[PDB]
Amino acid sequence: MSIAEDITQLIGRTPLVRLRRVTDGAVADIVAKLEFFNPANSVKDRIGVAMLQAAEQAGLIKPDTIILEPTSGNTGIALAMVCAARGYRCVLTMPETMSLERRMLLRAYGAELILTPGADGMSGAIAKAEELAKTDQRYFVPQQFENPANPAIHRVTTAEEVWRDTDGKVDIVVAGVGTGGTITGVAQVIKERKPSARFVAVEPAASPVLSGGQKGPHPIQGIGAGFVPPVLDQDLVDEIITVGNEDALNVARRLAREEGLLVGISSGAATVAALQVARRPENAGKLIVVVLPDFGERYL
């Protein structure tokens, strides 16, 4: 019998699809990894369960433990879903700038929300989470930007899925960097296994921190943290490509209309970059894997 015991056993094992029309000028093959096939429609499902599994396996989860994380993105959604499956109490902090729709989605999974001053952005959500953790020892904070289970799950699952499904033929992996876990985990495994493989990090042109620029506001959700995440191994990254807001939005829209792939803005951004790499004649005949991190419907 093939029956999952709970929804967390159905995380990962996402498929690859060849891009057919959003390929203008490509001389390389572009295939997309569809992370919206995860049960809560984003790549973060992988780390939501990984960081909690890791904590359980390390005996850090106690009878009175409350899961707590500062996040206005998919990590909150993933954690909320995994806590619902696990039967854990989930508390999330985020600026009151978060949409009402997103709040409703988190509450639907039974997460509890602590809204922080809109003007204070993420630092306010983080500060509140830091204080709550200090004053109450029941709180367990996954710390997605520093937790080693983040890149680790990507080594064990994401990287192997890419390796197997391409039968080892993968030449280049293109991925947007939020926590940096996806690209790091995949590089760690594939680059050791196939030293000729190359890895392209993607970030917003409006917030080109990995390139040496400064933090700025940008709409490409899931990427562009405005700092270099500890989890990222910048020495495995062979290239950074910046992507503008319009190009990201345009290509995201092209993916839905021309490929039937309704994906988020960050998927547009990663594909902008995969398209740019695919146009280089030295990459003729190569196989490029681009990670599409989430589903488009979330972005109404």
Partner: peptide
Amino acid sequence: DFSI
């Protein structure tokens, strides 16, 4: 601000 960032949404991750």
